[PDB]
Design a protein around this ligand. Sequence first.
Ligand SMILES: CN(C)c1ccc(C(=O)O)c(Oc2nc(Oc3cccc(-c4cccc(CN)c4)c3)c(F)c(N3CC[C@@H](N(C)C)C3)c2F)c1
Length: 245
Amino acid sequence: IIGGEFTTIENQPWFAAIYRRHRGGSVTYVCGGSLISPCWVISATHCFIDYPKKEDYIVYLGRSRLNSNTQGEMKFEVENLILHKDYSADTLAHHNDIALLKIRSKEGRCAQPSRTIQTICLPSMYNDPQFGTSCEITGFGKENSTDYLYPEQLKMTVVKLISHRECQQPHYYGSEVTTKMLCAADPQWKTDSCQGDSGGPLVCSLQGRMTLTGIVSWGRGCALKDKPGVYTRVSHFLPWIRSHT
Ligand SMILES: CN(C)c1ccc(C(=O)O)c(Oc2nc(Oc3cccc(-c4cccc(CN)c4)c3)c(F)c(N3CC[C@@H](N(C)C)C3)c2F)c1
């Protein structure tokens, strides 16, 4: 995340950190995700498409820091990696960029609630906030283009939803964004998702309840003028989520 502030998992208790395992016990961060039910984390397919083997991945919940431990964190294996069968990418966009990870602890249990681990609510079908609404994104992605290190502490920022008609304008993304995507940006183009933030949640507070509205998918650069972040529009995959869960 570019711009934005350090946060703790307490403030983002549905956030899931997804890593890939390596011989020796070392791991490398992959992508973000969100806990939508005790046994299911939702993320983006493009995070896994090159290495679709569920055995290689681990998921943390209740984790505030990238390479050190947080009190109360829970570690999980992936029982089922479900990628969208119609996922694809052209020269700019990911399509149907949504994935489900069935999680299972070493001891065989799903996630348990706590101050640092909670589910986010799913949206209602075709019901999303109107453009201009503030929503938050969270992730361990890069915060600076010249960095070789990702931030050690979780970050968040606030962006505003952009209408589909604005994002489809030629100096934005044109026909590259479909009704199955949503765009969001800082009005001053100062804060944005970046490398490593994909898979993570775009959350909007609806009537008090925090709702998973988007999943970080793609864009052009990070915090570039007239190039909003593009998210998978979760309210259009509810049937897919419901049936595969
Ligand atoms: C395999 N692993 C572990 C990972 C981990 C993280 C990411 C990620 O997206 O963050 C990832 O996907 C990808 N990672 C990239 O690196 C970067 C570099 C800089 C910014 C971003 C980036 C990521 C999310 C949102 C936004 C919008 N501000 C930007 C991604 C890519 F440029 C692509 N392209 C470039 C080509 C384009 N096209 C196929 C749509 C997609 C990509 F698909 C793979």
